[PDB]
Amino acid sequence: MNDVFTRAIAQADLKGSFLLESDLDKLASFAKEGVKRLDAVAALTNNAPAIISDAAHKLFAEQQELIQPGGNAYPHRRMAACLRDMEIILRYVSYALLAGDASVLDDRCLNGLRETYNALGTPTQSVARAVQLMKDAAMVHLKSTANVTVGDCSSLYSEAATYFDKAAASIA
Template sequence: FRLAACLRDMEIILRYVTYAMIAGDSSVLDDRCLNGLRETYQALGTPGSSVAVGVGKMKEAAIGIVNDPSGIARGDCSQLVSELAGYFDRAAAAVA
């Protein structure tokens, strides 16, 4: 059950990081996804640090996609990468 819940939550975190990127605002991520998530994992006996590692892996993959030179976007994406990294860092800190 815990593994299924963690995988589901990873999908939800990724979705809300995407929403935050589109909105340019972390409030949707905080309000709809992160608030109370740490407490949920504590109640389930799931180590938040392990969830934070998973969020970090999603961050690495997402940044890799943004920085992929064969992608459709050309030019300097450093601001986009910084914003994206910040949202993933926020999610990792919320569960750790």
């Protein structure tokens, strides 16, 4: 389970050379962006109830067969599992965001989810669509400037979007 720094260390060790000065500069730039990254992670943490709820209402507006009798999340426990998997996906993406790279998900969170949802009979595309709706809600919250030092987190918005979309692809 690697961050940008730890991974960089890993491949630098793989070539068996010292860290390259340019790599040092990239890590320094990451250090510069660290405060923005912490703002982003804190914002993601703060708006967790609102984001999970809003994603739920979009999902349920656009799909109803999930809640139909026998629908893949029909009972209260099963609907709760439906929502809590999407929130745990948010959990792990936030984890990667603070960690600064997308290794942690493919390491542990989405290591074997495909076969799990096939075995559960879960339609993958539904989980994917939930992921993009989570993405929409998340970007909506992150573009907010509430009580934050103004700047340019466009890199962070794009990179969290990469998290979301690659996780959604891995769901498939």
